[PDB]
Structure formats: C-alpha cells, structure tokens
Ligand binder design. Structure first.
Ligand SMILES: [Ca+2]
Length: 240
C-alpha cells in the first residue's frame, strides 16, 4: 500500500497473508480474505505459479512474532474457470483456497463480511485497502499491515478514456487514483473494505494497478468485484 498508515492490530481480522516457501523460509506474496474457517478468497493471479503456499491468519508484522499468528497449509486451490493469466483485464481474477485445517476465530481472526450479490457502490464511496504490499512503486513490502483510504470511482468514470478505458469491466471495482495512495505489488488478492449501512464489507479482491506505477493519478487500483461472484463462491464452497 502506497500512502498508507499502519492498521491497528484488530481492525481487519479477515486479512490474511498468502506466502510461498522460499528456501528454508517463507515469503509473503499476496493478501486474501478469510471467508470460512477453512476457506480464503484471493486473486487468481496470486496462484498462477506452481509454488508451495501457506496462509497466515492473525498476522500483523511480517518480520516479528505478534503472538497471534496461526499458520496453515493450502489443501486445494480453486481458480475461477474463466481466468486467463494472459488477460487480467478480462476479469475473473478470483480464487478460493481450502485450508488444510480450520483456523480458530478470535479478535485477530474473523470471517470477512461479503456484500449481497449485485451490490454496486455509489461513486466516491468510503473504502480502505489493506495489505503488506510495496509502500512505494518499485519499493519494498511493508513490515506492518497498512491501510489506505481509497474512495471508489464508479464504472462510468473508471472506464472513461482518461482513466482505464475498456480495460476496466463492470465485474471490477475501481478505488483511489489520487496519485498519492494506492495498492501496490504484494497487496494483490487482499480485501477492499467498504463501509455500507454502518458495516465494513469486503467489496473488492485486489487485482491490478497501472504498469506505469502504483500511485498514478487517474489510474485507480482495480479490484475484482466480490458482489459479482457470490453464487460462484457459494457453489465452490458447497461442492468442496
Ligand atoms: Ca508476525
């Protein structure tokens, strides 16, 4: 997250760290949202590589023991069947991970609230992106979980020529674009939390930013629109 602030430890308990095995250790690669005790929602592009993945829940600082983490292997990966790694702009950037064990819920580990199917947010709706992704274009991952206030940019504006044009689809949510605050590499797969009727819900799965940079004016961060995939998500959980 570029232009973020450090999240409080218990603000975003559905946020997870998706990590891959790297030598004798583990490296953070993506975020995700815990949606069942044994299921994580993340981005399809996070799991294109043939890596060994684990999920960490109750994480805050990637570089220090927080006394709250639970570590669990990934048992099954279900990518949306229309996902094409060659074409992120087509959409379908979503995947569900079945965890090898069910995690224990507490103040640091909670299920993410998902929006009702079909829900679209008004332009300029209040949301936060969260993640341990780069803190500057071509920078380095955060140590502590970061949040940035990224108001939505509706489809009509986001898909206009000076924003993302045809690259953005109605199956996506755009947010931010102020040139200061944004997602960045390593935030992929994580939540966009938006406040609706008093409750934060996870409206986005972080998908892409401009090839030109993370915080680029009129290139808001783009997310898979969770409310477009409720039936798909339910169908996967019910059949697995
Ligand atoms: Ca930690």
């Amino acid at each position: 997250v570029v232009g973020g602030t450090e999240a409080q430890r218990n603000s975003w308990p559905s946020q997870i760290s998706l990590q891959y095995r790297s030598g004798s250790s583990w490296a953070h690669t993506c975020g995700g949202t815990l949606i069942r005790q044994n299921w994580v929602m993340t981005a399809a592009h996070c799991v294109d590589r043939e890596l060994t993945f684990r999920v960490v829940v109750g994480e805050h600082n990637l570089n220090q023991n927080n006394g709250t983490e639970q570590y669990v292997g990934v048992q099954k990966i279900v990518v949306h069947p229309y996902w094409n790694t060659d074409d992120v702009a087509a959409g379908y950037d979503i995947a569900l991970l079945r965890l090898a064990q069910s995690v224990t819920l507490n103040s640091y580990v909670q299920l993410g609230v998902l929006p009702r199917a079909g829900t679209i947010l008004a332009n300029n709706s209040p949301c936060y992106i969260t993640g341990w992704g780069l803190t500057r274009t071509n920078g380095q991952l955060a140590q502590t979980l970061q949040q940035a206030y990224l108001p939505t940019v509706d489809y009509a504006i986001c898909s206009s020529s000076s924003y993302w044009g045809s690259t953005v689809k109605n199956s996506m949510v755009c947010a931010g674009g102020d040139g200061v605050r944004s997602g960045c590499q390593g935030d992929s797969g994580g939540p966009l939390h938006c406040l609706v009727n008093g409750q934060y819900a996870v409206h986005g799965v972080t998908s892409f930013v401009s090839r030109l940079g993370c915080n680029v004016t009129r290139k808001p961060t783009v997310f898979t629109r969770v409310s477009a995939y409720i039936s798909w998500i339910n169908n996967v959980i019910a059949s697995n």
